[PDB]
Structures are given as C-alpha cells and as structure tokens.
C-alpha cells in the first residue's frame, strides 16, 4: 500500500510499506506477535474491536464500516449522520444492532401505533411495570389530538403584554 | 422553571421552525378578521401581511423555549433576531 | 492488582471481593503484553474527580441516567480501574471541530 | 397510490411540520371535553359547571384540577383501559415529582 | 430499520442531540454544532506543503530587511521597520500558525486539506475584492494592528453556545477548533496585505460577513 | 367544544403514567356500588335500580340529572362504578406475569429465593431494564427450589451466611387454563423424599404471599409500589365502565336495551353473588370452588375471550359474545 507520510523537508510523500491481510480474526493473539505495529493493526471486524480496544475504538470502527459501504459507490454522506447512528448503537456501552432487536419497543410509546392485534398486551405490561410515556412521539400525540413537541412544535407561542 | 431575562443561554436568533409557527398563527388571525398592527400598503393576503408584521416587530407574541430537563426560556418576538 | 498467567481457579477467583473497601484487580498477562491504550483508534479517557463530575451533571443538568455509558468491564475501564459511578471524559480528535469532548459514565 | 404512510409521514418530520402532521393524522372523532385531576391524573373530576364545583374524591381535590381536549375515542380508549384495571394516568407537567 | 432506529432523536435548545427519553446521544450535534446545508469543502492550508513554503508564506519579521513586509502593500510599511512592539504581536500570529500545522497534522495524519467547514471564506474575499474595486496598485491602509488584533476579536464572536459557566465555554472553544484553524490561515497577516490586498475597508467588511454567515450556519434546535 | 365554562385551566397532555389500579383506588373514586344484576322496574316502575346503570353513574332519557354534574348524553364524561368480588380472581391477562413471580419468590414468606449473596444474581440486579432484569432474575430462581436459610459468603466456603429463616421447598408451577397447580418435594430421587404433591394454588395464598413481598424485592422486579404493587395484578374490586362505555339500544319507548357488556357483568355479578350465598348459608368445600372458578371464568372472559370456552349466553340463544380487550379488537384495530 502506499502511504501519504511527511517527508523531512514537511511536504507529505509516499512511502510504500507491506501490509499483511488475512482471512479469519483473532486480534488479541496476533496483535500480541512480535514485528507488527500493534499500534495500527484492524480488522473489519468491529466487535472485537470493541471487546479488545473498548466501546470508543469500537465506535469508530463502526464508523470507519458504515463509510466504507457508502464511498465503494462513489457515493458521499455528510459524516454527520453516520455519526449519529453510530453513536446510537454505542450509547449504553455495548454495540446495540439496528435491524429490529425488541419485539416491543426500540424508544416509542404504549400509545404509538398498535403494533401486534394485540396491543393489549403491551399496555398490560405498562401497567405492570408502570412506565412513563414521555409524549413526544407523533402518533401518541395524534391520539391525543395535540401536535408533537418536534420542529414547529417544540416550543409554545403566548401573548405578550408588553407591545405597546 | 422558568429562568430570568437575564442568564438566559439560548440562542438571540429566531429559529427557522419559530418562524414558520409565528407566521402560521399570525397569518390563521388575521385570516379571521383580527385587527392588523400595519399600514396594508395593498397586501390583502394573510400571510403576505403577517410577514410584513414581522418585519415591523408587530407582533406581541411570545415564544417559551423548553429545555430537555423541564425548564425554559421566554423571548419575544420583538427580541428575537430574524436572519434566516 | 493480581497478574496471573493462564488463569485462576473460580474457587481463588470469589476470593477477591472480600475485604472493603479495598478494591482488586486481575489481569491475565497476555491481556497486558501490549497496551491497547496506546492504539489508534483509541482516544483519551480521563477519570473525573466526583467534583467535576457534579460540575458536568450540573451545566448540562443532566441525570447520571441520561449520560452515555461506558461498561464496567470495558478494556479501557478495566485499564484505569473505573468503579461503577465513575465518568471519563474523553477526548477526541474530530473532522468537524477539532477535537470534541464525550462523556460515558461506568455501568 | 395517493396515500400518506409511514414514509411520507417520517418526511413530514424531518422538515419538522409538525401542525401540518397533526391536520393530516387527525381522525374525525369530536374534540370531547373533559376535566383531570392533577394528583391522580384520571377522568375522575365531576364538574358542576354552573356551581364552579370540581371535586376529584378519594384525592380531597377542588382546586388541583384542569382541563383538556382529546378526541373522544380517546376517552374511551382510556375509560376501556380503566375497565380492564389499567391506569392510563394524564398529566400536564412533564417534570415528574423529580 | 434505520428511520425507526432514529426517529426520536432531536436538536435541542441547548445544542444537545437527544432522544425521547432525553438521553445525551451527542454533547453537540455534529459535534461542530453546524446545519450540514451549511457546509462546504475548504482547504486548510496551514497542512500542506514544505516548511519553507510555509513560512515564506506565513512569516513576517518586522526585523529582518528581508523578511518584512515591502512597504509597498503597506501604507505604513516603513515605519513599521524594526518595530519591537508590533514584532511581539506577529510572533504570536506566527506561533499559533505553528501550532495549527501540528495540530491538523494529528488529526488528518492523511494529509487531507480539504474538509467540509461553514462560511466559505475565499468566495467572501473574492466580494470584498470586487466590491470595493480594490486596486493591485496602490499599498494598503491596514494597520498590523488592525489585522492581528482583528482576527483576534472576531474568534471570540463566532457563537455555537452561550453558556456562561467553564464546562460550555470550553465546549464552545472545542466546537469552534478545526473552523478558527481555518480562519487564522485565511487572514494571516501576509496573506491579507501581499495576497488578498485588502484595504482597512473591504478588510472590515469581510469580518463581519465571516460572523454573519458563521451564526446563519449554526443548527436550529427543533432539527429532526 | 360544548359551548360552555369551566373555570379549570385549559391544557395539553405532557406524559401518560401507567399503572395497575389497587382495590382501594378503585373505591375511592367509584361512585355507586352495585348490587342487582337487574336494570329498570322496580315492581314495575321502570327507571332504573341502585343495581346498575344509574346510582351515580352516567343517565339516559335526556335527564340531566347525573351527580349533579348535570349536562347530558353529550357533555357527560360517564362516571365510574364500584361492586366488590365474594372471593380473589386472577386478571386474565397476567396470568403468566403471576406464574413467574411466584417462581422467583418463596411461596412461603414472599422472600426472593436468590439474594445479593450470588453473584450470578447481582449481575441480574443490576440491569436497569423492568423487562429484562426481571427475566434474568427470573431464569436464575426458578432453578432455586428451597428458600434457602444458610450460604457461602464473599469469603470461606466454610463460613456461610445467613438470609430470611424460610427452609421449606418451593413448588413448581404449571399453568391449567385459569389455574395454577403447584408439586412439591423433599429433593429428586433422594431416600424417603420421592414421589411428588400435586394441589391446586388458591388465588387467596397467592394474594397473601405478594403482599408479603417487600418493596425491594418486587421493585427489583419491574414493579413500582406506588403504581403497580404485584398483588394488583389479582382483581378484588372489580370497575364498572360507565353506560358511555356499555350503552343500551332503546327504540324511543317501551322496549328493552343494554350492551353486551352490561350482560356479561350480570353474570359476574350473578355468579359472585351465587358464591356468597354458599357461606351465608354454609356449603361443602368442591362446591365454594366450582362457584369461585365460575366468577373467576366470567371476570377473565369479562375483559378476554381466549380461553376453554366462549361464554356467548346474553339474550341470545344463538350464542354471540364480545369483551374488552375485543372490544378494543376494533378500538386498537380501528384507530
Ligand atoms: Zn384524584
Ligand atoms: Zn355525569
Ligand atoms: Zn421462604
């Protein structure tokens, strides 16, 4: 691979350097042998990662994952909003997938859309548990007839007695 | 909670979405034949007028800023600096 | 802190919470011949004091609930010897403002 | 075609027009009237409108009370819940006792 | 999946993201505090090249015959010969472009110089320039003062938070970081007089755009 | 809406609080307390009885009268009842709730039967999810099956510790339709200890036994003492949703008219009152409970219809029928 590295004079040159790539993962055995930069080693594995470098060297590789699927089309996404998702899937420490892990739930409300012919159920369990609807969904709002507290919504408006 | 004029961290600027609801509530009033606070030099469209009230700080309207932990902010039309 | 070398018998290993406050720690050599926080994509933790812990809990008027979190077994945690209710603030370097500070607190 | 679902309403919010979401996914069901306890946050309040009389028993409330809108199948919904043992509790402030 | 995963997930008026449990997701959205339709692809400059470019490029020793600047672009160009005062003010202009380079180069170990960043400072000086007709001839009336101490101000104006505490204010100096870094390397003084030739006019002009457009960037809360 | 005054402040709703509804709340706020399972003719003199649909509750015939709240059909936001069970019933849909948090405590003294001495179960206690926790606490107790009296510290094996004085042996719980049935035994093939005991667990021994359970442990569980205590999930005051909810067909005169609901409360109350009359006049004890069992299948079958049967006898010998938690079938269906 070659390498964009400051030269001695400041101005960036390439340096070629061989790099080894490998097909299976084991990161803590071979980030331990001798001649390697365990400074640098990866793998596109980030969930070892993650359990040998921690959550934030998780994160970013997680990061360094999702861009890498973007830009192999030549596409381009403001960092940005893959940040945001990457640190939703990192926020309780632990690498927290995407594609539909609760049967009920994710961050909604025993009000938002009936979800399952019995919703019944998951206000049975509500009760039970006595959670708390926070009230700043869409539809939990529209079942109250009110607008949710997003955009245009997340501030009141009132008259001022002071206009003279 | 409320907090005082003064310590308030808030941004001075009004916000695009502050804008939107302002104009829009202004605007269904004078759709209802409230009384205007300007000289219509010929507009006759809510609001087309409602937007020439902002600009004239017409409007004695107040908007409360929440916070995530329950607290909040109250700034005025009036105060609030539009450039969007 | 215990360094073993391949491992401890689960009789010897209920044998460390036993003597409070007094912490203590194990590690397994191998988890040590490198220090992972000397690796790239390993930013900054930093322990701190309950003091400024208050402060950040405080300006932000947050909960310790709504923080983010970072677990107690987590090989950076497990480095600095966090305790569960312990924050770091860690700081990193970042291609929109130049470095960004995050907090997570120990789970 | 020519419905508004789920992907158009997640547009809706990303421009943030929350009123124009609220017009759209607004049933027909009356805008019913109904009074709230602020201790327990149940329809238990009998209003005697003309006697300005407001009494939520059980709490010892007259003065603790409100007032809000809600479509009315809302209000069963809610009555329904209170059938079936559930406690559907409708508070105006959002920070808790917190 | 990615919608529903999200959806809650709001600017808030503090300039925290969060979500409906009112969980910190990030401390500032973006971590920059910025609208992404309000950035665009800049060069930091400071990053590239070889030293001597640099410094040809950045340096301005009011002590050396060589070294300073002609006062041909300046209208005080030679009384300011051999200005110890004014020499301590460029030697901390030049520190700090110093500390800039080493600083970019951790962060983009890379190489990259362009990066998307608010306010596109090249196309205000390009106004500026046809605005006031500024002619290529003629010296500037820019004081160093003006310029260093300029600069200087307008980096205590650019406002992501307002907070008055330590914590925010910090905060408020990290989110600002990479943007000041750029700012600093556009309006080096060298590069204002032998460059740009701006006139203590078109000069003044410019940073009040660069905060007009600065705070016109900054995230509204409500953003979904 | 409704064109009239109400000094109370208008406002919106800023959060939902859920919760069980405890026996004494339900009194506290109920207006009448209902009796007869009949409605309308008192010896004739139609109107309505002390019994149901009327006493407090919301009224029909365009009277204002209603608690003084006066108003109408329209404006009258149907007030709540009252009508106290002869005996304790499981709510339908916690049957399965009930079953498991009686496998995580002793059914002896309400004691949980891992405490913080494991270490297994202070990772459990730790999770701060009222759904997962108590299904990692859950997993690792119904494994324990005597309320254990003596365990290993934090220290020597030799030394143990002691914990809430309750050695008996715990009972695993199968689920029979509305019932649950418990077998007990003095270990698994060990000498003089085989073979098992099959009885039956009284709705009334479950009751007691959560309301010996502290507050920590069953808020160690998801519930919340001051919104969901664990012996609410057991129904002992029963609510009667006002005439809003179960309305009356009345053609204009002369005719007769109440919703399905109001029926299948009837036979609740009916089959409640038939229980009481067993002990007001003394009764063998298979009868008692055949005639609990039968309030217990109306008061389930009352709010949920998916279980041994589909009691649809209300007037019609054609046999139809609707509950509840159906009704919301085209409540959370049609909305
Ligand atoms: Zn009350
Ligand atoms: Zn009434
Ligand atoms: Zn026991």
């Known amino acids: 691979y070659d390498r964009k590295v400051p030269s001695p004079t400041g101005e960036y040159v390439k340096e070629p350097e061989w790099v080894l790539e490998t097909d299976g993962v084991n990161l803590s055995e071979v980030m331990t042998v001798p001649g390697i930069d365990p400074t640098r080693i990866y793998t596109n594995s980030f969930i070892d990662i993650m359990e040998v470098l921690g959550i934030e060297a998780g994160r970013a590789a997680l990061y360094k994952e999702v861009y890498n699927v973007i830009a192999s089309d030549g596409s381009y996404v403001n960092y940005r909003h893959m940040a945001l998702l990457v640190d939703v899937m990192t926020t309780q420490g632990g690498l927290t997938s995407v594609t539909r892990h609760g049967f009920n739930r994710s961050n909604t409300g025993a009000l938002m859309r009936c979800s399952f012919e019995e919703t019944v159920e998951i206000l049975f369990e509500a009760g039970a548990s006595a959670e708390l609807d926070d009230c700043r969904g869409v539809s939990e709002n529209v079942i109250l007839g009110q607008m949710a507290p997003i955009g245009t919504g997340a501030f009141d408006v009132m008259i001022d007695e002071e206009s003279l | 909670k409320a907090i005082p004029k003064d310590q308030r961290a808030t941004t001075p600027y009004m916000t695009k979405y502050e804008r939107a609801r302002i104009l829009g509530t202004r605007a269904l009033q004078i759709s209802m034949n409230a009384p205007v606070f300007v000289d219509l030099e010929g507009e006759t469209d809510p609001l087309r007028i409602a937007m020439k009230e902002l600009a004239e700080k017409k409007i004695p309207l107040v908007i409360r800023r929440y916070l995530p932990d329950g607290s909040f902010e109250d700034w005025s039309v009036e105060e609030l600096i539009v450039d969007l | ?107 | 075609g020519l419905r508004f679902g789920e992907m158009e309403r997640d547009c809706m919010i990303a421009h943030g027009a929350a009123s124009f979401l609220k017009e759209r996914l607004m049933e027909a069901s009356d805008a019913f009237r109904v009074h709230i306890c602020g201790i327990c946050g149940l329809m238990t309040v009998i209003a005697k409108l003309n006697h300005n009389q407001f009494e939520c028993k059980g709490c010892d409330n007259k003065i603790d009370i409100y007032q809000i809108h809600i479509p009315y199948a809302a209000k069963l919904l809610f009555q329904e819940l209170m059938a079936m043992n559930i406690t559907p509790r409708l508070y105006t402030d959002r920070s808790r006792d917190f | 999946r990615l919608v529903k995963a999200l959806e809650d997930i709001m600017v808030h008026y503090d300039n925290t993201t969060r979500n409906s449990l009112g969980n910190v997701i990030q401390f500032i959205y973006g971590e920059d505090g910025m609208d992404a339709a309000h950035i665009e692809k800049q060069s930091l400059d400071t990053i590239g090249g070889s030293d001597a470019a640099f410094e040809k490029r950045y340096r301005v020793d009011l002590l050396n015959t060589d070294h300073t600047l002609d006062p041909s672009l300046l209208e005080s160009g030679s009384e300011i010969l051999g200005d110890l005062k004014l020499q301590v003010l460029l030697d901390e202009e030049y520190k700090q472009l110093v500390k800039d380079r080493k600083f970019l180069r951790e962060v983009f170990v890379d190489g990259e110089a362009n990066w998307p960043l608010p306010v596109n400072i090249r196309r205000i000086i390009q106004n500026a320039q046809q605005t006031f007709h500024i002619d290529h001839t003629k010296p500037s009336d820019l004081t160093i003062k003006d310029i260093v101490l300029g600069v200087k101000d307008l980096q205590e104006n650019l406002l992501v938070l307002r907070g008055k505490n330590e914590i925010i204010q910090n905060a408020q100096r990290d989110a600002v970081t990479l943007f000041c870094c750029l700012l600093r390397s556009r309006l080096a003084t060298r590069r204002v007089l032998q460059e740009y030739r701006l006139t203590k006019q078109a000069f003044d002009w410019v940073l009040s755009n660069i905060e007009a457009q600065f705070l016109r960037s900054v995230v509204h809360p409500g953003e979904m | 809406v409704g064109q009239q005054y109400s000094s109370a402040p208008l406002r919106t709703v800023k959060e939902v609080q859920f919760g069980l509804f405890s026996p004494e709340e339900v009194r506290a706020i109920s207006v009448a307390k209902i009796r007869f399972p009949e409605t309308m003719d008192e010896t004739q003199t139609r109107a309505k009885i002390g019994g149901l649909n009327d006493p407090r509750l919301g009224s029909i015939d365009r009277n204002l009268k209603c608690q003084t709240c006066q108003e109408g059909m329209n404006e009258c936001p149907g007030h709540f009842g009252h009508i106290d069970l002869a005996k304790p019933v499981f709510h339908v849909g916690f049957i399965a709730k009930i079953k498991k948090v009686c496998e995580c405590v002793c059914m002896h003294c309400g004691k949980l039967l891992l405490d913080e001495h494991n270490e297994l179960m202070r990772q459990a206690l730790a999770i701060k999810d009222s759904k997962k926790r108590f299904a990692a606490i859950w997993t690792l107790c119904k494994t324990k099956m005597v309320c254990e009296t003596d365990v290993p510290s934090e220290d020597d094996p030799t030394q143990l510790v002691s914990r809430g004085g309750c050695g008996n042996t715990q009972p695993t719980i199968r689920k029979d339709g509305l019932k649950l049935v418990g077998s007990w035994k003095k270990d698994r093939a060990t000498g003089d200890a085989d073979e098992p005991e099959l009885r039956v667990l009284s709705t009334e021994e479950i009751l007691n036994i959560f309301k010996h359970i502290s507050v920590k442990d069953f808020t160690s569980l998801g519930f919340n003492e001051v919104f969901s205590r664990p012996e609410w999930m057991i129904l002992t005051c029963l609510p009667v949703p006002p005439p809003p909810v179960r309305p009356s067909i009345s053609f204009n005169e002369s005719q007769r008219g109440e919703d399905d609901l109001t029926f299948k409360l009837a036979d609740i109350l009916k089959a409640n009152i038939s229980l009481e009359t067993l002990e007001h006049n003394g009764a063998p004890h298979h009868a008692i409970e055949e005639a609990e069992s039968l309030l217990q299948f109306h008061v389930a079958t009352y709010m949920d219809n998916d279980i041994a049967g589909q009691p649809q006898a209300l007037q019609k010998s054609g046999r139809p029928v609707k509950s509840i938690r159906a009704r919301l079938k085209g409540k959370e269906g049609r909305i």
Do not use: W
């Open chain 3, 1 to 107: 802190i215990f360094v073993y070398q391949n491992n401890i018998t689960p009789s010897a290993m209920k044998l460390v919470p036993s003597i409070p406050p007094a912490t203590i720690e194990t590690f397994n050599e191998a988890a040590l011949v490198v220090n992972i926080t000397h690796h790239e994509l390993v930013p900054k933790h930093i322990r701190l004091s309950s003091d400024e812990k208050r402060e950040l809990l405080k300006r932000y008027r947050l909960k310790e609930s709504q923080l983010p979190r970072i677990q107690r077994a987590d090989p950076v945690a497990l480095y600095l010897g966090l305790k569960r209710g312990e924050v770091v603030k860690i700081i990193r370097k970042s291609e929109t403002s130049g470095r960004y500070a995050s907090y997570r607190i120990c789970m």
